[PDB]
Write an enzyme that holds these catalytic residues in place. Structure first.
Site, PDB file in Angstrom:
ATOM      1  N   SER A   1       0.799  -1.283   0.073  1.00 46.28           N
ATOM      2  CA  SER A   1       0.122   0.023  -0.052  1.00 46.28           C
ATOM      3  C   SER A   1       0.861   1.444   0.003  1.00 46.28           C
ATOM      4  O   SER A   1       1.734   1.326   0.817  1.00 46.28           O
ATOM      5  CB  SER A   1      -0.834  -0.114   1.288  1.00 46.28           C
TER       6      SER A   1
HETATM    7  N1  GSH Z   1      -6.690   8.477   1.738  1.00 47.17           N
HETATM    8  C1  GSH Z   1      -6.547   7.387   2.646  1.00 47.17           C
HETATM    9  C2  GSH Z   1      -6.506   6.090   1.826  1.00 47.17           C
HETATM   10  C3  GSH Z   1      -6.976   4.948   2.916  1.00 47.17           C
HETATM   11  C4  GSH Z   1      -7.243   3.564   1.886  1.00 47.17           C
HETATM   12  O1  GSH Z   1      -7.609   3.462   0.650  1.00 47.17           O
HETATM   13  N2  GSH Z   1      -7.277   2.380   2.656  1.00 47.17           N
HETATM   14  C5  GSH Z   1      -7.404   1.138   2.048  1.00 47.17           C
HETATM   15  C6  GSH Z   1      -5.870   0.298   1.872  1.00 47.17           C
HETATM   16  S1  GSH Z   1      -5.172   1.173   0.595  1.00 47.17           S
HETATM   17  C7  GSH Z   1      -8.554   0.396   2.898  1.00 47.17           C
HETATM   18  O2  GSH Z   1      -8.251   0.281   4.308  1.00 47.17           O
HETATM   19  N3  GSH Z   1      -9.417   0.004   2.385  1.00 47.17           N
HETATM   20  C8  GSH Z   1     -10.467  -1.001   3.048  1.00 47.17           C
HETATM   21  C9  GSH Z   1     -11.517   0.199   3.845  1.00 47.17           C
HETATM   22  O3  GSH Z   1     -11.481   1.358   3.524  1.00 47.17           O
HETATM   23  O4  GSH Z   1     -12.502  -0.493   4.356  1.00 47.17           O
HETATM   24  C10 GSH Z   1      -5.032   7.397   3.398  1.00 47.17           C
HETATM   25  O5  GSH Z   1      -4.143   8.259   2.529  1.00 47.17           O
HETATM   26  O6  GSH Z   1      -4.893   6.839   4.378  1.00 47.17           O
END
Ligand code: GSH
Ligand code: GSH
Lengths: 207, 207
Positions: free
Chosen positions: A9
């Site tokens: 990530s």
């Molecule tokens: N804008 C956020 C993006 C966070 C994000 O997209 N997290 C994803 C992993 S790449 C995630 O945990 N997805 C599962 C969910 O949101 O339930 C950051 O920069 O931390």
């Protein structure tokens, strides 16, 4: 401090490099989303938005990668260059952080995710938007050696995580001179660069 | 200081309320996007990303609404409560700023704009993600009286700029009790509240 993440990530890798920059050790917590580990009741109590990266520093839970990077710089950093106290200089850094989230990575995701997870054909409309984003970055870099000024800041770190992702996805960075040059330079001067390099290999497993 | 804006624009209203909160007067420069004024040579020279809001403060050009808001708070603010210096308190506010941009507003824009301006059919999945964003905010507001902490901060101001737009767009905010209560309270208490209300009416001119 616990760090709930996934090695491949970008937002996670951005925090990893920032932690290396300020000499903070992260207690890694591999969070497998495909096993619903982010949906565990214990995790929801820490982060109701159930997303990674998520940091827990002595009881203090925090998410949003760029907020985490700024937090580590402000609380544990000593080198003003990484996140300058001067309002004007810090503002340029912050603008680039928002750029990275809402324009650079956002358009990258809009174009590649549907091809990866939905097997949808490459979308011409979104390809151009992604291209326009890198073009902007290229312009931001004209003259200056770093994305938000003349010294390495957390803006370079988060943008590196993002651009290194464009790279593994096969995007042609060579057609953006300033971006390509900055990338080559930063990929070798960013604290924790080795962690980022190891991480993209995991993301590569998407193509 | 010059402020290139459009009254109906949410990111612009976020800056206007922040400016009112810190006693900063903005020389308003209406920049009509429908007339392509954001691509005039002179504007591209100041902001190559050709977007509003764009601020010019004694030669310093800055864009990205939330970066402008924090800049105004850091340089001209005198009430630490609006944007706390404490790393942890600051971190909570910052995470909410990224939430407002990348989750709350982003999903609102992706769902409504293609319909209002591009006259495209509504996207059901994007509507779902939008509902999920308000749900998250609803949870954040459970217990906590303000978006970040127990006092009005710039996070409340930008979320007001965003939520008020959800309101005029016809999104059912009422089904989210904590969001609705916070809105009822903040749309009145917030500095520049009248500016925001007048601005949303100009935005309504698109429905
Ligand atoms: N804008 C956020 C993006 C966070 C994000 O997209 N997290 C994803 C992993 S790449 C995630 O945990 N997805 C599962 C969910 O949101 O339930 C950051 O920069 O931390
Ligand atoms: N993330 C930006 C969003 C800026 C934005 O979407 N600006 C729109 C007006 S609401 C614009 O200028 N669009 C025309 C363009 O970008 O060329 C912020 O918070 O300022």
């Amino acid at each position: 401090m616990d760090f709930y993440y996934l090695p491949g990530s970008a937002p996670c890798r951005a925090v990893q490099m920032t932690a290396a920059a300020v000499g903070v050790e992260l207690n890694l917590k591999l969070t497998n989303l495909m096993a619903g580990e982010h949906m565990k009741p214990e995790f929801l109590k820490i982060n109701p938005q159930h997303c990674i990266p998520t940091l827990v520093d002595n009881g203090f839970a925090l998410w949003e990668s760029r907020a985490i990077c700024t937090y580590l710089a402000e609380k544990y950093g000593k080198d003003d260059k990484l996140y300058p106290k001067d309002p004007q200089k810090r503002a340029v850094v912050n603008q680039r952080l928002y750029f990275d989230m809402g324009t650079l990575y956002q358009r990258f995701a809009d174009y590649y995710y549907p091809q990866i997870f939905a097997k949808q054909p490459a979308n011409a409309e979104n390809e151009k938007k992604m291209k326009d984003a890198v073009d902007f970055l290229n312009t931001f870099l004209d003259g200056h050696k770093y994305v938000a000024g003349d010294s390495l800041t957390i803006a370079d770190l988060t943008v590196l995580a993002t651009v290194s992702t464009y790279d593994v996805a096969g995007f042609e960075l060579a057609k953006y001179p300033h971006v390509a040059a900055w990338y080559e330079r930063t990929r070798k001067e960013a604290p924790g660069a080795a962690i980022n390099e190891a991480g993209i290999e995991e993301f590569r497993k998407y193509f």
